[PDB]
Amino acid sequence: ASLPHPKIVKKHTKKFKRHHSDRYHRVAENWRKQKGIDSVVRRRFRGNISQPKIGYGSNKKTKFLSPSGHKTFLVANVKDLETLTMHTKTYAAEIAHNISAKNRVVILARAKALGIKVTNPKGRLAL
Amino acid sequence: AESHRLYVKGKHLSYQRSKRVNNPNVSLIKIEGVATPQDAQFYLGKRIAYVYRASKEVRGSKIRVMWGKVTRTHGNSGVVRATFRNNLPAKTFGASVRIFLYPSNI
Amino acid sequence: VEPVVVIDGKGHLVGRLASVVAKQLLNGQKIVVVRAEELNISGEFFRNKLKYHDFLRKATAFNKTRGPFHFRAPSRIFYKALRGMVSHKTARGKAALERLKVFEGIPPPYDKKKRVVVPQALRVLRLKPGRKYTTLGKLSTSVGWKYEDVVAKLEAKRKVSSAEYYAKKRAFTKKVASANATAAESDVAKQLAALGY
Amino acid sequence: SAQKAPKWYPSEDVAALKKTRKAARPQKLRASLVPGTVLILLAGRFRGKRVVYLKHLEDNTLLISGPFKVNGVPLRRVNARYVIATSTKVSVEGVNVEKFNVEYFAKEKEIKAERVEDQKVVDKALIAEIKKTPLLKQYLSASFSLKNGDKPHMLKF
RNA sequence: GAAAUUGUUGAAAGGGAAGGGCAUUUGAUCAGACAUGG
RNA sequence: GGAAUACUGCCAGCUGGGACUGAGGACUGCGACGUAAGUCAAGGAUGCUGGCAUAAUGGUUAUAUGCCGCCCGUCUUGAAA
RNA sequence: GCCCUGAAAAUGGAUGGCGCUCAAGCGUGUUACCUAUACUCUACCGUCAGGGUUGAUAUGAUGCCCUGACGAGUAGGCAGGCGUGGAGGUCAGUGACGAAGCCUAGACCGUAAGGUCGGGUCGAACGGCCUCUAGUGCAGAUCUUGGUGGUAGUAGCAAAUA
RNA sequence: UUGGCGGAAAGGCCUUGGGUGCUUGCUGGCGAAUUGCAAUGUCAUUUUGCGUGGGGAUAAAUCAUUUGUAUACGACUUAGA
């Protein structure tokens, strides 16, 4: 249901967790680069956490693609849903978190009608 | 025929490694009866399997297989380099392994 | 290429035997070394008794009970040598040694199991003639091994039984090689001979 | 809106391939594979079985027989790389064998009466030729396996 | 009605710390698939 | 006296086994083999076959195993101190 | 030359360890083999440089496209981005048929700062894009305020007759 | 099943006699496919619970109390049908 695209290669699937985020509660996993003078991580000694650098960048040809092969698009309603009308093999729709349950059946309706793939159906869904 | 074996005995010795760094992507096998790199050239390309047991049955068996192939010789004494579809567990350093006769170019 | 390998300890050089054995384990081979009392070290008695004593004075200063342990028996003297050649503190090391047994004399099951030798560790293949060496048992008994005489007394009793055993065997292989004489030159005999057998 | 609309959008025209330049040339089997040669199957359903090479089918495969009333293998396809080719060998002059191709094996359970008939046709001539050399028939029915202190890399076959 | 810290339940590991990195075994969990004549 | 062989070197001489890669996506270029129409290994892989369904496969996670990894921040020629 | 004497220090100990004696030691030679983030070929990320192309010719001209080379980094400089309170403009944006917030070894996107979704909880508001603005991002300061631990059911609860 | 032998951890070994399955020492008669050209096809022995049918056996230790050969508290040594 989507364009060709080469096999998605991910290059570094793991997280990059800030050094010692695993040591003290007070320190969030959120990446932050060490500045310290003797720091093993900054100085890149064998045996430590790898730091995010540009060599890890994804293939432009596969960048931003999900498994399905589409880039996802945040959809708030039908007007928004409808921008992806010609680009049905290229993009997928994602229904915003704050979209009410009843409205979700309407966007969901119109997508099927247009053949746009939805990423988060089974959303605010009874049963 | 108490014997049914169509494979050569083998032992998983190590990963590829320097003194203090290993490479789990490559594995070193001792093939039973091979003693020289000139012998070990016979098995280049042959298929290896490491066969283990489990608790969960999958396709009706509690026996599982890790398949790989002999890729080149190692050192001077018949030891050989091998890569498997996944990477041998390292717990198995000393475990047995199977070198088959196919692809034959006999 | 074998389940378990029993090694007749005699005539071997400790460290050379240790190195070949300690490698077998890390490869999966189940080893069991016997007669560790008649094991050899190059260099005559006095040097090794001096070396052993040089090892014997090391201990935790505040609590000798926790510093280096000095096992005196030949089987454990060799086991010292081996373990020094295995990365034992790690799990892999633990498991390797858990494939090994070392015995002074040849105690039961192996009493009827063929022992083998390791040439590259065999003194008489490795030592230059004229060079002095050592008998581990005589060493161990000089550093507190209370049982050289017991194993001696038993080994004699064991070799006597073995003597009559091999005599029996030697008598039967006779019959086999004296009841072959007929079949020695049949047709199938010449038939076999053609293909090497 | 939840997300500002993109300003480009690709094209959903899926392109055609460049004129690829690969051209199937025939596969020349190795020298030890002459028709009639006793083969050892090293894999699959009839692994270990000793078997007679008959024909190089057009899809690279080796027509096999065994033959059936000797060891159980029927007329059968078999790939060359899972086979040891021995030195021992039977003749195959008096075996017709032309009717057998890819389509003979074409997946169009049951067991066709044509297949069972062709078997006895082809086999009859083989068991005929096989039986002249003593113990060849016996050999073919025994299964192959490595013994303690076999070294494939030196054994001759 | 967050966190520190705590009780209970459940899974797991633990021969003088714990935590981390590359790799895989095992266990758990989660996926992308979608369309072909009745 | 007539050779052979070693050593060294060249061949736009022939060939067996093993390994990793297959980026690119109409045509366009330089060629090769053909008397020929044509064909080709010539500006980047194709062909044939089979396998996977409460499954193959992959992601994460816990544990185990192999190797490896001292506490950050700081002043300092020099910090695990 | 090698070996021996000359050669005495305080916890128990160090050719790294085991151990090694025609060595696994000393001198010399010849092959083979092991292995770096280096070298060679290739994919991808980025940076720089050179070049092609809006001639009518749908959606990116600060764009598409071709080619070559390059990538260490404290103090430090510049650049391109991520997130926050409030402002003008715009999606006639989401919302009591559930906003914001919170929880979640569930999922997806980004090299990353971060973004998005599911489920649970919740109950009145809130967001995307173009711009404006600053009391705009914390691990440290014997930092400020508040809250909570190990220590620990521990020290202890014994002067003054009962 | 008849005799022995084995205490270094003997826990195994020799031996008598028949019974029974097989016997490729040799000569016959059948079967095998379609598991589709490899992938997945010998089941090993540990433990632990339950299900049966046969044989078998019918206790102690601890708390409490007590002694003082003992004792900081546990512990130790006594005694109680």
From Swiss-Prot, chain A:
GO cellular component, one term: cytosol
Recorded GO MF terms: structural constituent of ribosome
InterPro entries, per database record: Ribosomal_eL32, Ribosomal_eL32_CS, Ribosomal_eL32_sf
GO biological process: cytoplasmic translation
Phosphoserine, modified sites: 39
Protein localization: Cytoplasm
Superkingdom in the source lineage: Eukaryota
Alphabetically ordered keywords of this record: Cytoplasm, Phosphoprotein, Ribonucleoprotein, Ribosomal protein
Cited SUPFAM superfamilies: Ribosomal protein L32e (SSF52042)
Function description: Component of the ribosome, a large ribonucleoprotein complex responsible for the synthesis of proteins in the cell. The small ribosomal subunit (SSU) binds messenger RNAs (mRNAs) and translates the encoded message by selecting cognate aminoacyl-transfer RNA (tRNA) molecules. The large subunit (LSU) contains the ribosomal catalytic site termed the peptidyl transferase center (PTC), which catalyzes the formation of peptide bonds, thereby polymerizing the amino acids delivered by tRNAs into a polypeptide chain.
Similarity field: Belongs to the eukaryotic ribosomal protein eL32 family.
Description of how the protein assembles with itself and partners: Component of the large ribosomal subunit (LSU). Mature yeast ribosomes consist of a small (40S) and a large (60S) subunit. The 40S small subunit contains 1 molecule of ribosomal RNA (18S rRNA) and 33 different proteins (encoded by 57 genes). The large 60S subunit contains 3 rRNA molecules (25S, 5.8S and 5S rRNA) and 46 different proteins (encoded by 81 genes).
Record protein name field: Large ribosomal subunit protein eL32
From Swiss-Prot, chain B:
GO cellular component, one term: cytosolic large ribosomal subunit
Keywords: Acetylation, Cytoplasm, Isopeptide bond, Ribonucleoprotein, Ribosomal protein, Ubl conjugation
GO BP annotation list: cytoplasmic translation; ribosomal large subunit assembly; ribosomal large subunit biogenesis; rRNA processing
PTM summary: N-terminally acetylated by acetyltransferase NatA.
Taxonomic superkingdom: Eukaryota
InterPro entries in the cross-refs: Ribosomal_eL33, Ribosomal_eL33_CS, Ribosomal_eL33_sf, Transl_B-barrel_sf
Cysteine-cysteine disulfides: none
ATP-binding as UniProt keyword: no
GO molecular function ontology, one term from the record: structural constituent of ribosome
SUPFAM superfamilies in the cross-refs: Translation proteins (SSF50447)
Modified residues annotated as N-acetylalanine in this record: 1
Crosslinked positions (Glycyl lysine isopeptide (Lys-Gly) (interchain with G-Cter in ubiquitin)): 46
One Pfam short name: Ribosomal_L35Ae
Primary location: cytoplasm
Coiled-coil segments: none
Similarity comment: Belongs to the eukaryotic ribosomal protein eL33 family.
Function: Component of the ribosome, a large ribonucleoprotein complex responsible for the synthesis of proteins in the cell. The small ribosomal subunit (SSU) binds messenger RNAs (mRNAs) and translates the encoded message by selecting cognate aminoacyl-transfer RNA (tRNA) molecules. The large subunit (LSU) contains the ribosomal catalytic site termed the peptidyl transferase center (PTC), which catalyzes the formation of peptide bonds, thereby polymerizing the amino acids delivered by tRNAs into a polypeptide chain.
PANTHER family: 60S RIBOSOMAL PROTEIN L35A
Other known facts: There are 2 genes for eL33 in yeast.
Protein name: Large ribosomal subunit protein eL33A
Species name: Saccharomyces cerevisiae (strain ATCC 204508 / S288c) (Baker's yeast)
This protein's encoding gene: RPL33A
UniProtKB/Swiss-Prot annotation, chain C:
Cross-link (Glycyl lysine isopeptide (Lys-Gly) (interchain with G-Cter in ubiquitin)): 175
One example GO MF annotation: RNA binding
InterPro entries: Ribosomal_uL13, Ribosomal_uL13_CS, Ribosomal_uL13_euk/arc, Ribosomal_uL13_sf
Locations listed in the record: Cytoplasm
GO cellular component, one term: cytosol
Main location: cytoplasm
Keywords tagged on the record: Acetylation, Cytoplasm, Isopeptide bond, Ribonucleoprotein, Ribosomal protein, Ubl conjugation
Post-translational modification: N-terminally acetylated by acetyltransferase NatA.
UniProt xrefs under NCBIfam families: L13_A_E
Stored PANTHER family: LARGE RIBOSOMAL SUBUNIT PROTEIN UL13, RIBOSOMAL PROTEIN L13
Family per similarity comment: Belongs to the universal ribosomal protein uL13 family.
UniProt subunit comment: Component of the large ribosomal subunit (LSU). Mature yeast ribosomes consist of a small (40S) and a large (60S) subunit. The 40S small subunit contains 1 molecule of ribosomal RNA (18S rRNA) and 33 different proteins (encoded by 57 genes). The large 60S subunit contains 3 rRNA molecules (25S, 5.8S and 5S rRNA) and 46 different proteins (encoded by 81 genes).
Record's protein name: Large ribosomal subunit protein uL13A
Organism whose genome encodes this protein: Saccharomyces cerevisiae (strain ATCC 204508 / S288c)
From Swiss-Prot, chain D:
Principal subcellular localization: cytoplasm
UniProt keyword Acetylation, yes or no: yes
Entry comment on modification after translation: N-terminally acetylated by acetyltransferase NatA.
Location within or outside the cell: Cytoplasm
UniProt modified residues of type Phosphoserine: 11
N-acetylserine found at: 1
Keywords: Acetylation, Cytoplasm, Isopeptide bond, Phosphoprotein, Ribonucleoprotein, Ribosomal protein, Ubl conjugation
One Pfam family matching this protein: Ribosomal_L6e
Role noted for this protein: Component of the ribosome, a large ribonucleoprotein complex responsible for the synthesis of proteins in the cell. The small ribosomal subunit (SSU) binds messenger RNAs (mRNAs) and translates the encoded message by selecting cognate aminoacyl-transfer RNA (tRNA) molecules. The large subunit (LSU) contains the ribosomal catalytic site termed the peptidyl transferase center (PTC), which catalyzes the formation of peptide bonds, thereby polymerizing the amino acids delivered by tRNAs into a polypeptide chain.
Protein name (database record): Large ribosomal subunit protein eL6A
Gene: RPL6A
